[PDB]
Amino acid sequence: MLKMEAVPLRLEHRQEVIDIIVASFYNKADLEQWLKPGVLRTDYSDILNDIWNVLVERDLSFVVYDTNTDRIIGTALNFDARNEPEVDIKSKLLIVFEFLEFCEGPIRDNYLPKGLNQILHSFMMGTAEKLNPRENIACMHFMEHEVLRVAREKQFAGIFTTNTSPLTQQLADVYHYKTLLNFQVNEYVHSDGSRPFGDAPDEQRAIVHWKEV
Ligand SMILES: NCCC(=O)NCCc1ccc(O)c(O)c1
Ligand SMILES: [Ca+2]
């Protein structure tokens, strides 16, 4: 049985966290797959490197250790939704983040609690590539359990996230997140009038999720 431990993010975790995020998102993320070609592994590391110091400083994120191997198998990256660093994104990932803001912005700024230390933004989550289904689902359960604990211990009002894969969307549902938006990603229009995810099937959703703690 997989034995796990959540450890706050430290500065030295940078490459391990990058490895896990890159392996979790590159060629696997449901949104970026429609922006091919030209989405590179470094587009993810470039973002993480730019925010890494603030990400550790804010003390809201953590890594998950397999305590039997003492290696990192997962990570949950969190910010105060109203106190996030500003990243100038150069890659096609800017479209992903502008879409996510399209999903989150209206709801966050008009329906969720105002002020700092209210909205724990679970903005990135990843698990190690070598995890089998039983290790991955359990790491996902464990990080969900720990994100809630961080939210309560840090006195946030709730956990805010946009889930873009069927598994994370279904996980959020059985964890009793409320759906605040279920957007059909192939209907999103870019600033140039194109639908960057237009080739996606109608069934691919972006779901904004929110759970009061
Ligand atoms: N509660 C899970 C949320 C998560 O971990 N990721 C979804 C947000 C995201 C960010 C960048 C991307 O490139 C992307 O496809 C999706
Ligand atoms: Ca340890």
PDB file of C-alpha atoms and ligand atoms in Angstrom:
ATOM      1  CA  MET A   1       0.000   0.000   0.000  1.00  0.00           C
ATOM      2  CA  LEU A   2       1.241   3.465  -0.939  1.00  0.00           C
ATOM      3  CA  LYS A   3       2.359   5.398   2.153  1.00  0.00           C
ATOM      4  CA  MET A   4       2.537   9.149   1.616  1.00  0.00           C
ATOM      5  CA  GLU A   5       3.502  12.360   3.388  1.00  0.00           C
ATOM      6  CA  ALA A   6       2.830  15.984   2.467  1.00  0.00           C
ATOM      7  CA  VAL A   7       5.826  18.269   2.916  1.00  0.00           C
ATOM      8  CA  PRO A   8       5.741  22.062   2.385  1.00  0.00           C
ATOM      9  CA  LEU A   9       7.460  23.304  -0.746  1.00  0.00           C
ATOM     10  CA  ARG A  10      11.148  24.121  -0.244  1.00  0.00           C
ATOM     11  CA  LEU A  11      13.419  26.054  -2.596  1.00  0.00           C
ATOM     12  CA  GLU A  12      15.403  22.887  -3.414  1.00  0.00           C
ATOM     13  CA  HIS A  13      12.290  21.113  -4.760  1.00  0.00           C
ATOM     14  CA  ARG A  14      12.357  23.213  -7.938  1.00  0.00           C
ATOM     15  CA  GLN A  15      13.619  20.586 -10.382  1.00  0.00           C
ATOM     16  CA  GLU A  16      11.583  17.763  -8.849  1.00  0.00           C
ATOM     17  CA  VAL A  17       8.432  19.901  -9.052  1.00  0.00           C
ATOM     18  CA  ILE A  18       9.274  20.914 -12.620  1.00  0.00           C
ATOM     19  CA  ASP A  19       9.849  17.278 -13.590  1.00  0.00           C
ATOM     20  CA  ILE A  20       6.475  16.276 -12.149  1.00  0.00           C
ATOM     21  CA  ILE A  21       4.536  19.168 -13.700  1.00  0.00           C
ATOM     22  CA  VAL A  22       6.172  18.737 -17.115  1.00  0.00           C
ATOM     23  CA  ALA A  23       5.512  14.990 -17.077  1.00  0.00           C
ATOM     24  CA  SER A  24       1.919  15.600 -15.980  1.00  0.00           C
ATOM     25  CA  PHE A  25       1.082  18.303 -18.542  1.00  0.00           C
ATOM     26  CA  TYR A  26       3.318  17.987 -21.608  1.00  0.00           C
ATOM     27  CA  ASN A  27       1.590  15.932 -24.332  1.00  0.00           C
ATOM     28  CA  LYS A  28      -1.134  15.004 -21.820  1.00  0.00           C
ATOM     29  CA  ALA A  29      -3.009  18.200 -20.958  1.00  0.00           C
ATOM     30  CA  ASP A  30      -6.457  18.213 -22.552  1.00  0.00           C
ATOM     31  CA  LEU A  31      -6.375  21.897 -23.540  1.00  0.00           C
ATOM     32  CA  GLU A  32      -2.832  22.256 -24.940  1.00  0.00           C
ATOM     33  CA  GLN A  33      -3.279  19.193 -27.160  1.00  0.00           C
ATOM     34  CA  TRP A  34      -5.386  21.361 -29.475  1.00  0.00           C
ATOM     35  CA  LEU A  35      -2.712  24.103 -29.636  1.00  0.00           C
ATOM     36  CA  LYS A  36      -0.172  21.769 -31.257  1.00  0.00           C
ATOM     37  CA  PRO A  37       2.240  22.353 -32.763  1.00  0.00           C
ATOM     38  CA  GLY A  38       4.674  24.564 -30.878  1.00  0.00           C
ATOM     39  CA  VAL A  39       3.932  23.762 -27.222  1.00  0.00           C
ATOM     40  CA  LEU A  40       7.213  22.744 -25.583  1.00  0.00           C
ATOM     41  CA  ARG A  41       8.252  21.161 -22.295  1.00  0.00           C
ATOM     42  CA  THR A  42      10.155  24.333 -21.366  1.00  0.00           C
ATOM     43  CA  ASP A  43       6.936  26.382 -21.596  1.00  0.00           C
ATOM     44  CA  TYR A  44       5.924  24.747 -18.306  1.00  0.00           C
ATOM     45  CA  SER A  45       9.350  25.024 -16.649  1.00  0.00           C
ATOM     46  CA  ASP A  46       9.609  28.646 -17.825  1.00  0.00           C
ATOM     47  CA  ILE A  47       6.436  29.491 -15.891  1.00  0.00           C
ATOM     48  CA  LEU A  48       7.482  27.555 -12.786  1.00  0.00           C
ATOM     49  CA  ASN A  49      10.973  29.089 -12.772  1.00  0.00           C
ATOM     50  CA  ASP A  50       9.513  32.600 -13.007  1.00  0.00           C
ATOM     51  CA  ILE A  51       7.247  32.056  -9.972  1.00  0.00           C
ATOM     52  CA  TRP A  52       9.327  29.540  -8.037  1.00  0.00           C
ATOM     53  CA  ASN A  53      10.565  31.918  -5.342  1.00  0.00           C
ATOM     54  CA  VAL A  54       7.170  33.515  -4.654  1.00  0.00           C
ATOM     55  CA  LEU A  55       5.603  30.034  -4.823  1.00  0.00           C
ATOM     56  CA  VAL A  56       7.826  28.795  -1.995  1.00  0.00           C
ATOM     57  CA  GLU A  57       7.606  32.102  -0.096  1.00  0.00           C
ATOM     58  CA  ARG A  58       3.785  32.064   0.009  1.00  0.00           C
ATOM     59  CA  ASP A  59       3.935  28.676   1.811  1.00  0.00           C
ATOM     60  CA  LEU A  60       0.663  27.328   0.384  1.00  0.00           C
ATOM     61  CA  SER A  61       2.043  24.546  -1.839  1.00  0.00           C
ATOM     62  CA  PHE A  62       3.503  21.166  -0.971  1.00  0.00           C
ATOM     63  CA  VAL A  63       5.071  18.047  -2.420  1.00  0.00           C
ATOM     64  CA  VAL A  64       4.003  14.488  -1.666  1.00  0.00           C
ATOM     65  CA  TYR A  65       6.638  11.945  -0.670  1.00  0.00           C
ATOM     66  CA  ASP A  66       6.372   8.204  -1.005  1.00  0.00           C
ATOM     67  CA  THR A  67       7.671   7.523   2.502  1.00  0.00           C
ATOM     68  CA  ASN A  68       8.820   4.039   1.476  1.00  0.00           C
ATOM     69  CA  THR A  69      11.114   5.412  -1.253  1.00  0.00           C
ATOM     70  CA  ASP A  70      11.554   8.939   0.206  1.00  0.00           C
ATOM     71  CA  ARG A  71      10.944  10.334  -3.287  1.00  0.00           C
ATOM     72  CA  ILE A  72       8.437  12.898  -4.502  1.00  0.00           C
ATOM     73  CA  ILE A  73       5.482  11.396  -6.366  1.00  0.00           C
ATOM     74  CA  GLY A  74       3.134  14.387  -6.505  1.00  0.00           C
ATOM     75  CA  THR A  75       2.778  18.102  -5.964  1.00  0.00           C
ATOM     76  CA  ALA A  76      -0.014  20.610  -5.352  1.00  0.00           C
ATOM     77  CA  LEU A  77       0.705  24.223  -6.301  1.00  0.00           C
ATOM     78  CA  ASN A  78      -1.501  26.814  -4.610  1.00  0.00           C
ATOM     79  CA  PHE A  79      -1.776  30.578  -4.342  1.00  0.00           C
ATOM     80  CA  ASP A  80      -4.137  32.993  -2.723  1.00  0.00           C
ATOM     81  CA  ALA A  81      -6.301  33.643  -5.773  1.00  0.00           C
ATOM     82  CA  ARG A  82      -6.238  37.395  -5.049  1.00  0.00           C
ATOM     83  CA  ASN A  83      -2.473  37.461  -4.398  1.00  0.00           C
ATOM     84  CA  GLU A  84      -0.880  35.665  -7.398  1.00  0.00           C
ATOM     85  CA  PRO A  85       2.316  36.699  -9.203  1.00  0.00           C
ATOM     86  CA  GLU A  86       2.093  38.284 -12.644  1.00  0.00           C
ATOM     87  CA  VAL A  87       3.743  36.109 -15.308  1.00  0.00           C
ATOM     88  CA  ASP A  88       4.392  37.323 -18.844  1.00  0.00           C
ATOM     89  CA  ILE A  89       3.825  34.050 -20.696  1.00  0.00           C
ATOM     90  CA  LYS A  90       5.473  33.883 -24.112  1.00  0.00           C
ATOM     91  CA  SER A  91       4.311  30.491 -25.376  1.00  0.00           C
ATOM     92  CA  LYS A  92       0.943  29.318 -26.647  1.00  0.00           C
ATOM     93  CA  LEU A  93       0.230  28.544 -22.968  1.00  0.00           C
ATOM     94  CA  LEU A  94      -0.877  32.191 -22.712  1.00  0.00           C
ATOM     95  CA  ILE A  95      -4.018  31.050 -24.533  1.00  0.00           C
ATOM     96  CA  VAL A  96      -4.579  28.362 -21.885  1.00  0.00           C
ATOM     97  CA  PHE A  97      -4.169  30.861 -19.056  1.00  0.00           C
ATOM     98  CA  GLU A  98      -6.324  33.509 -20.739  1.00  0.00           C
ATOM     99  CA  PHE A  99      -8.992  30.840 -21.198  1.00  0.00           C
ATOM    100  CA  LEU A 100      -8.706  29.820 -17.544  1.00  0.00           C
ATOM    101  CA  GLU A 101      -9.114  33.480 -16.554  1.00  0.00           C
ATOM    102  CA  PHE A 102     -12.127  33.638 -18.889  1.00  0.00           C
ATOM    103  CA  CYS A 103     -13.564  30.754 -16.855  1.00  0.00           C
ATOM    104  CA  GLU A 104     -12.459  31.960 -13.424  1.00  0.00           C
ATOM    105  CA  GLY A 105     -12.329  35.751 -13.574  1.00  0.00           C
ATOM    106  CA  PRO A 106     -16.038  36.636 -13.747  1.00  0.00           C
ATOM    107  CA  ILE A 107     -16.981  34.125 -11.042  1.00  0.00           C
ATOM    108  CA  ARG A 108     -14.020  34.824  -8.750  1.00  0.00           C
ATOM    109  CA  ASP A 109     -14.289  38.617  -8.723  1.00  0.00           C
ATOM    110  CA  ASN A 110     -18.095  38.861  -8.559  1.00  0.00           C
ATOM    111  CA  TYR A 111     -19.343  35.835  -6.585  1.00  0.00           C
ATOM    112  CA  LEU A 112     -16.499  34.654  -4.340  1.00  0.00           C
ATOM    113  CA  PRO A 113     -15.369  36.295  -1.076  1.00  0.00           C
ATOM    114  CA  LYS A 114     -13.498  39.579  -1.363  1.00  0.00           C
ATOM    115  CA  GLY A 115     -10.159  40.205   0.281  1.00  0.00           C
ATOM    116  CA  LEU A 116      -6.914  38.334   0.771  1.00  0.00           C
ATOM    117  CA  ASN A 117      -6.670  34.923   2.468  1.00  0.00           C
ATOM    118  CA  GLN A 118     -10.158  33.940   1.264  1.00  0.00           C
ATOM    119  CA  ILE A 119      -9.728  31.972  -1.963  1.00  0.00           C
ATOM    120  CA  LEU A 120      -7.128  29.196  -2.001  1.00  0.00           C
ATOM    121  CA  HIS A 121      -6.410  28.806  -5.717  1.00  0.00           C
ATOM    122  CA  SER A 122      -5.406  25.221  -6.495  1.00  0.00           C
ATOM    123  CA  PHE A 123      -3.909  26.096  -9.866  1.00  0.00           C
ATOM    124  CA  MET A 124      -1.595  23.169 -10.646  1.00  0.00           C
ATOM    125  CA  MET A 125      -1.435  19.558  -9.528  1.00  0.00           C
ATOM    126  CA  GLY A 126       0.790  16.768 -10.804  1.00  0.00           C
ATOM    127  CA  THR A 127       1.900  13.225 -10.099  1.00  0.00           C
ATOM    128  CA  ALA A 128       5.074  11.382 -11.052  1.00  0.00           C
ATOM    129  CA  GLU A 129       5.144   9.653 -14.429  1.00  0.00           C
ATOM    130  CA  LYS A 130       5.934   6.185 -13.039  1.00  0.00           C
ATOM    131  CA  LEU A 131       2.787   5.985 -10.879  1.00  0.00           C
ATOM    132  CA  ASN A 132       0.440   3.154 -11.843  1.00  0.00           C
ATOM    133  CA  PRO A 133      -3.334   3.753 -11.703  1.00  0.00           C
ATOM    134  CA  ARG A 134      -3.502   2.626  -8.074  1.00  0.00           C
ATOM    135  CA  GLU A 135      -0.639   4.921  -7.081  1.00  0.00           C
ATOM    136  CA  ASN A 136      -1.994   7.866  -9.085  1.00  0.00           C
ATOM    137  CA  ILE A 137      -5.612   7.778  -7.811  1.00  0.00           C
ATOM    138  CA  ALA A 138      -4.315   7.446  -4.245  1.00  0.00           C
ATOM    139  CA  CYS A 139      -1.842  10.298  -4.609  1.00  0.00           C
ATOM    140  CA  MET A 140      -4.677  12.389  -6.052  1.00  0.00           C
ATOM    141  CA  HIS A 141      -6.923  11.498  -3.095  1.00  0.00           C
ATOM    142  CA  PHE A 142      -4.092  12.313  -0.687  1.00  0.00           C
ATOM    143  CA  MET A 143      -3.355  15.711  -2.239  1.00  0.00           C
ATOM    144  CA  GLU A 144      -7.056  16.596  -2.198  1.00  0.00           C
ATOM    145  CA  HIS A 145      -7.171  15.669   1.486  1.00  0.00           C
ATOM    146  CA  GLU A 146      -4.087  17.800   2.136  1.00  0.00           C
ATOM    147  CA  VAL A 147      -5.199  20.828   0.080  1.00  0.00           C
ATOM    148  CA  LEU A 148      -8.298  21.002   2.292  1.00  0.00           C
ATOM    149  CA  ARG A 149      -6.061  20.797   5.372  1.00  0.00           C
ATOM    150  CA  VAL A 150      -3.845  23.629   4.119  1.00  0.00           C
ATOM    151  CA  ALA A 151      -6.960  25.682   3.380  1.00  0.00           C
ATOM    152  CA  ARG A 152      -8.341  25.232   6.895  1.00  0.00           C
ATOM    153  CA  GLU A 153      -5.016  25.588   8.710  1.00  0.00           C
ATOM    154  CA  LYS A 154      -4.313  28.795   6.764  1.00  0.00           C
ATOM    155  CA  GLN A 155      -7.855  30.147   7.375  1.00  0.00           C
ATOM    156  CA  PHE A 156      -8.990  30.384   3.771  1.00  0.00           C
ATOM    157  CA  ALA A 157     -12.714  30.391   3.109  1.00  0.00           C
ATOM    158  CA  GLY A 158     -12.640  27.848   0.287  1.00  0.00           C
ATOM    159  CA  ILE A 159     -10.713  26.105  -2.462  1.00  0.00           C
ATOM    160  CA  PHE A 160     -10.974  27.405  -6.038  1.00  0.00           C
ATOM    161  CA  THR A 161      -9.834  25.476  -9.092  1.00  0.00           C
ATOM    162  CA  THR A 162     -10.560  24.859 -12.770  1.00  0.00           C
ATOM    163  CA  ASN A 163     -10.454  21.169 -13.640  1.00  0.00           C
ATOM    164  CA  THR A 164      -9.710  20.461 -17.290  1.00  0.00           C
ATOM    165  CA  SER A 165      -9.430  16.658 -17.399  1.00  0.00           C
ATOM    166  CA  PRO A 166     -12.199  14.082 -16.828  1.00  0.00           C
ATOM    167  CA  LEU A 167     -10.363  12.568 -13.844  1.00  0.00           C
ATOM    168  CA  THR A 168      -9.826  15.804 -11.915  1.00  0.00           C
ATOM    169  CA  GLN A 169     -13.346  16.960 -12.783  1.00  0.00           C
ATOM    170  CA  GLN A 170     -14.782  13.675 -11.514  1.00  0.00           C
ATOM    171  CA  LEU A 171     -12.521  13.792  -8.438  1.00  0.00           C
ATOM    172  CA  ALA A 172     -13.749  17.305  -7.610  1.00  0.00           C
ATOM    173  CA  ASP A 173     -17.355  16.125  -7.910  1.00  0.00           C
ATOM    174  CA  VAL A 174     -16.996  13.200  -5.491  1.00  0.00           C
ATOM    175  CA  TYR A 175     -15.135  15.555  -3.137  1.00  0.00           C
ATOM    176  CA  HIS A 176     -18.293  17.727  -3.154  1.00  0.00           C
ATOM    177  CA  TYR A 177     -16.876  20.715  -4.978  1.00  0.00           C
ATOM    178  CA  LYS A 178     -19.639  22.896  -6.327  1.00  0.00           C
ATOM    179  CA  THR A 179     -19.616  23.493 -10.069  1.00  0.00           C
ATOM    180  CA  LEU A 180     -19.592  27.236 -10.742  1.00  0.00           C
ATOM    181  CA  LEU A 181     -18.983  26.889 -14.500  1.00  0.00           C
ATOM    182  CA  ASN A 182     -19.065  23.986 -16.961  1.00  0.00           C
ATOM    183  CA  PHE A 183     -17.694  25.520 -20.147  1.00  0.00           C
ATOM    184  CA  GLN A 184     -17.475  23.728 -23.492  1.00  0.00           C
ATOM    185  CA  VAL A 185     -13.853  24.406 -24.409  1.00  0.00           C
ATOM    186  CA  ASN A 186     -14.412  24.290 -28.180  1.00  0.00           C
ATOM    187  CA  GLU A 187     -16.664  27.369 -27.868  1.00  0.00           C
ATOM    188  CA  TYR A 188     -13.966  29.612 -26.388  1.00  0.00           C
ATOM    189  CA  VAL A 189     -13.009  32.422 -28.769  1.00  0.00           C
ATOM    190  CA  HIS A 190      -9.500  33.881 -28.802  1.00  0.00           C
ATOM    191  CA  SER A 191      -8.781  37.592 -29.209  1.00  0.00           C
ATOM    192  CA  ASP A 192      -8.167  36.965 -32.938  1.00  0.00           C
ATOM    193  CA  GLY A 193     -11.615  35.431 -33.415  1.00  0.00           C
ATOM    194  CA  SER A 194     -10.298  31.869 -33.649  1.00  0.00           C
ATOM    195  CA  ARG A 195     -11.403  28.937 -31.495  1.00  0.00           C
ATOM    196  CA  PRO A 196      -8.024  27.575 -30.295  1.00  0.00           C
ATOM    197  CA  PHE A 197      -9.709  24.478 -28.811  1.00  0.00           C
ATOM    198  CA  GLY A 198     -12.358  24.330 -31.545  1.00  0.00           C
ATOM    199  CA  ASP A 199     -11.273  20.888 -32.723  1.00  0.00           C
ATOM    200  CA  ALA A 200     -12.003  19.425 -29.279  1.00  0.00           C
ATOM    201  CA  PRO A 201     -15.174  17.323 -28.973  1.00  0.00           C
ATOM    202  CA  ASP A 202     -18.193  18.965 -27.387  1.00  0.00           C
ATOM    203  CA  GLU A 203     -17.744  16.595 -24.436  1.00  0.00           C
ATOM    204  CA  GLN A 204     -14.437  18.161 -23.346  1.00  0.00           C
ATOM    205  CA  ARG A 205     -15.274  20.609 -20.560  1.00  0.00           C
ATOM    206  CA  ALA A 206     -13.491  23.142 -18.431  1.00  0.00           C
ATOM    207  CA  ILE A 207     -15.156  23.114 -15.023  1.00  0.00           C
ATOM    208  CA  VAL A 208     -14.651  25.819 -12.419  1.00  0.00           C
ATOM    209  CA  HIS A 209     -14.879  24.197  -8.991  1.00  0.00           C
ATOM    210  CA  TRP A 210     -15.316  25.708  -5.552  1.00  0.00           C
ATOM    211  CA  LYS A 211     -15.618  24.164  -2.104  1.00  0.00           C
ATOM    212  CA  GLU A 212     -16.062  26.087   1.120  1.00  0.00           C
ATOM    213  CA  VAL A 213     -13.851  24.712   3.876  1.00  0.00           C
TER     214      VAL A 213
HETATM  215  N1  LIG B   1      -7.299  21.002  -9.604  1.00  0.00           N
HETATM  216  C1  LIG B   1      -6.488  20.642 -10.777  1.00  0.00           C
HETATM  217  C2  LIG B   1      -6.050  21.874 -11.561  1.00  0.00           C
HETATM  218  C3  LIG B   1      -4.707  21.619 -12.329  1.00  0.00           C
HETATM  219  O1  LIG B   1      -3.848  21.029 -11.824  1.00  0.00           O
HETATM  220  N2  LIG B   1      -4.516  22.125 -13.697  1.00  0.00           N
HETATM  221  C4  LIG B   1      -5.579  22.870 -14.372  1.00  0.00           C
HETATM  222  C5  LIG B   1      -5.062  24.301 -14.759  1.00  0.00           C
HETATM  223  C6  LIG B   1      -4.139  24.288 -15.904  1.00  0.00           C
HETATM  224  C7  LIG B   1      -3.003  25.114 -15.897  1.00  0.00           C
HETATM  225  C8  LIG B   1      -2.118  25.110 -16.991  1.00  0.00           C
HETATM  226  C9  LIG B   1      -2.360  24.289 -18.074  1.00  0.00           C
HETATM  227  O2  LIG B   1      -1.444  24.292 -19.190  1.00  0.00           O
HETATM  228  C10 LIG B   1      -3.501  23.459 -18.077  1.00  0.00           C
HETATM  229  O3  LIG B   1      -3.795  22.544 -19.255  1.00  0.00           O
HETATM  230  C11 LIG B   1      -4.384  23.467 -16.982  1.00  0.00           C
HETATM  231 CA    CA B   2      10.440  12.656   3.735  1.00  0.00          CA
END
